[model samples]
Target: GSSGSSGSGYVIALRSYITDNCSLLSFHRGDLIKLLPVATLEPGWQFGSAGGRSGLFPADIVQPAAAPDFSFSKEQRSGSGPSSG
Candidate 1:
């Protein structure tokens, strides 16, 4: 699961409709989406929707609930803590 840090979700939205196929995963500007940020192999941000859609939403298009909290590597997390711990 290359998705971003698990359980860390966000409420985001778009300024317009985005689509891949005419019948799937398309959302409009007024639709408030519950998005879980995930990791991806692409340039855009990966997100899984509360509505069960998972794909890359343009990093510039989707608005986050707050400034994004990106995942750090495990080593970084450990290093940031006290050595004894």
Candidate 2:
């Protein structure tokens, strides 16, 4: 049963999962639970640092004078980590 509101079950579930999966396995039962939300929020505050937004395309793709030299075309760098997806 919800402590206050019945409609908050989803929020509670998300909180539970975030608290569990985000916590370090070795210190799951330690005091880390209290710091999950804060620690998580800290990273969010750095939006646009590296993995901030998506769909960034150059205005023009004009061919260069010399042949292009690249290995990977595009790479997901921000929230595209293992745990994210």
Candidate 3:
């Protein structure tokens, strides 16, 4: 239905990012970008290629590709019961 599985390690864009600095990658909302291999650049920055532009963007502005808000958070059940005399 789409391109020939160009990339599976992609990320979903959550926010629109546009900056004057060319060092950072600028992207729009709801954009699917290919995940580029990054070792270490910024603490909260993500680098990918989209719209024929490859650069760095804030990690918070995008979510991991695959499921729709799949909550990985699990509730920790405390087994502490009847600890009083």
Candidate 4:
């Protein structure tokens, strides 16, 4: 998975879509005795959010009309701490 913003399930869904539609696995194979150097890179690579905005949304949709009274913290992430036995 890339980061906490997109979980494992989301990552898997993205991978499945790319592999099925783009045939990335097939691209990893070559007839010239070796695959391309960038063969390992897959399609549909979604990176992080920008300027404290979520990546899933477009800039036009996320642009604020006015300044807000509060600040936002984008550091929230999933934690896998120990559980009671």
**Among all candidates shown, the one with the greatest TM-score:** 3
TM-score of each: 0.45, 0.11, 0.60, 0.15
For residues 1-85, could you state the per-residue lDDT of candidate 4 as single tens digits? 4566621211111111113422222111111111112333234333222223222211111212222234566888788786975
Give per-candidate clash totals.
3, 0, 1, 0
Model 2 pairs in collision = none
Give the 10-residue window scoring lowest on summed lDDT in candidate 2: 8-17
Q: Which of the two candidates, 3 or 4, achieves a greater TM-score against the reference?
A: 3
2 against 3, candidate with superior lDDT: 3
Ranking by lDDT: 3, 1, 4, 2
In the order shown, the candidates' Cα RMSDs to the true structure are 8.9, 23.6, 9.9, 18.1
Best by lDDT: 3
Candidate 3 residues 34-68, lDDT tens each?
88787777789778887787888888878887833
Each prediction's whole-model lDDT (CA):
0.57, 0.21, 0.77, 0.26
C-alpha RMSD in Å of predicted model 3 compared with the true structure: 9.9
Compared to the true structure, candidate 4 yields what TM-score?
0.15
Ordered by TM-score, highest first, the candidates read 3, 1, 4, 2
